[PDB]
Design a protein around this nucleic acid. Sequence first.
RNA 1: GAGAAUGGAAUUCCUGGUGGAGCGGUGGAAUGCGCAGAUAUCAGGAGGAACACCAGUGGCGAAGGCGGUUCUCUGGGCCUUUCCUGACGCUGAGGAGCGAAAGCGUGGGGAGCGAACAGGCUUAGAUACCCUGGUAGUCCACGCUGUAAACGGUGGGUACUAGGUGUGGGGUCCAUUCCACGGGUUCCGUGCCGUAGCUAACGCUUUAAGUACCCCGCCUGGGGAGUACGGCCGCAAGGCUA
RNA 2: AAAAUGUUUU
Lengths: 87, 96, 67, 117, 32
Amino acid sequence: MDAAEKKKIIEEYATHPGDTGSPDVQVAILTKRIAELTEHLKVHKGDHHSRRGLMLMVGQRRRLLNYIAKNDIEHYRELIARLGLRR
Amino acid sequence: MRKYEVMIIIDPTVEERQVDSLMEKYLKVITDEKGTVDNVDVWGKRRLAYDIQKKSEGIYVVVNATCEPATIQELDRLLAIDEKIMRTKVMRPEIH
Amino acid sequence: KVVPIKTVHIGAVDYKDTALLRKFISERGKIRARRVTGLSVQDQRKVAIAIKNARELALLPYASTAR
Amino acid sequence: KKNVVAGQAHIKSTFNNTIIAITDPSGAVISWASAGTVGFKGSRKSTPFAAQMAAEAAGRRAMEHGMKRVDVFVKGPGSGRETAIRSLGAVGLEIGPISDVTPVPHNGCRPPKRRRV
Amino acid sequence: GSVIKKRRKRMAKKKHRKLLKRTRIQRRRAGK
RNA sequence: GAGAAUGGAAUUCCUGGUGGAGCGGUGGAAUGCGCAGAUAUCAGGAGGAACACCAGUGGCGAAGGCGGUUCUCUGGGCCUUUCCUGACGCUGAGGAGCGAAAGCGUGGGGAGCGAACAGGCUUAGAUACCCUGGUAGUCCACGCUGUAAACGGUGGGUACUAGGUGUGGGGUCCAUUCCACGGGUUCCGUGCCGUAGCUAACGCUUUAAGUACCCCGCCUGGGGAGUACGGCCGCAAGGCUA
RNA sequence: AAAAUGUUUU
Ligand SMILES: [Mg+2]
Ligand SMILES: [Mg+2]
Ligand SMILES: [Mg+2]
Ligand SMILES: [Mg+2]
Ligand SMILES: [Mg+2]
Ligand SMILES: [Mg+2]
Ligand SMILES: [Mg+2]
Ligand SMILES: [Mg+2]
Ligand SMILES: [Mg+2]
Ligand SMILES: [Mg+2]
Ligand SMILES: [Mg+2]
Ligand SMILES: [Mg+2]
Ligand SMILES: [Mg+2]
Ligand SMILES: [Mg+2]
Ligand SMILES: [Mg+2]
Ligand SMILES: [Mg+2]
């Protein structure tokens, strides 16, 4: 998250070239952040405050995915298929 | 590639030449992996505000170097394992 | 109160720079309180951190003791 | 026996009594006195007069040991500090830089529980 | 609060805890 | 917030020098320590724990809470004119996690402090206060426990309803600068005073305990009782439901 | 500095 791969993620998950805040981009960014924080917590199992931040990110991503699936179910399926298949 | 400032307090018995040799070898271990060294300043011998390892004076060095966190940590552990340097401090000015 | 103690500005703190740290250290060797040093909260915090660093790094005494 | 000339003084005044130590600047003590040594015992050895007596006794013995003007370090939250200073002055020898060598923790060790008198 | 209510509850709790301490063994032999 | 390294003072202990009769402690004492050299004093060393000043009228965190310094890793907040998505919001039974201190398990550590304990005092007695000692514990690693006056005794969200006056954070504007001192203004905190209003009163009052809407928890006289029985959780202490 | 207590009238 030195903004390099963040911009990369924004551009390769954007719906249109100017898109930077749509639910797809938000879910992609949140998933990358959840992965990074999961690794950090695996290193530091005792970081309860960061784990709470991780849970907040998880819930936010869940609500965004719920909105996406409520609007366009096939788009939701494609997005989650790209993003870890929702296991 | 962040930038750090290391202040080094070297045993006062050092009288030139070997201080430069130590600085050269530590800058070498910095520069072995893309770690540029911006500046090295030798304040010289100064009286310590309090005794450090039974020594009333010390040689002061300031090293401004841009490098990786792993490289700066490895330089710090080298300075720690060295027996010829009284103290080290590694500042990272967040702005400059 | 404390407004009569006019706010003082210092610029860069630079724990190496002993002049400012001496100006803000007490005659006994302690860190002066904010209401007597006339610094903003951020400047006072930076001055205190710099004083602690200089103390640990031998540029300043932990306590000047006898005057 | 031997003339030490300069010497120095340590005035440890606590809430219970006062102890005076005249010592060689090398740290070796030349003479010493306390309220317990000079007569007083128990509660009545915390008084400033007890510190007066002890300080003058220590100063006198240091004098027949041959000891001139003193640099003095005082320590402790007692009451006999100044009085002992006067006492040394009255017995007569130039007093120099009265110090404040009393210790002070940086939190450090935990203090004992608060008394519940 | 009059602190009397807390004192009444305090005494009830303390008496029950004393009962538990004195009957600790019997409860674990047969019961809770 | 987590990890690692590391700084100085102080206490205690150790070694040595010096020195000699007490030291210590209290309302007063004694137990205790001390000519087998204590207390004191100086030098050197070991070790554990807590971080003076900065430091509060302050900051941060969902709460519990958080203060030596440095680096590494990481969470959230605030502001901004543009930019993007386009109601994606709010609350949330059950459930899950976090949750001071004490406590528990295995191992480590142990300076100081200190339940229990021993002794001395006080006392009619003193299983206390006070004094001298002092073990668990306090500390670390990994678990467990899951309770507090865990309190603002005030659930979360939102809109509206005089002001006055401190203070913390981000902008922006102005004059002299071409810094900053200063004033404004805006957004978000955090106090105090105070109007309308509310309240049994005390008091609250834009950080509501006012005027309203949404959702959750909870109350129905005092004891018996947060007890019994049952069940769940726990190694236990016990907790929860009741 | 510690220094306790106060049955049943009608
Ligand atoms: Mg840890
Ligand atoms: Mg303070
Ligand atoms: Mg406050
Ligand atoms: Mg549009
Ligand atoms: Mg639960
Ligand atoms: Mg604990
Ligand atoms: Mg344990
Ligand atoms: Mg153990
Ligand atoms: Mg005791
Ligand atoms: Mg609390
Ligand atoms: Mg409650
Ligand atoms: Mg709620
Ligand atoms: Mg409300
Ligand atoms: Mg406000
Ligand atoms: Mg009400
Ligand atoms: Mg129960």
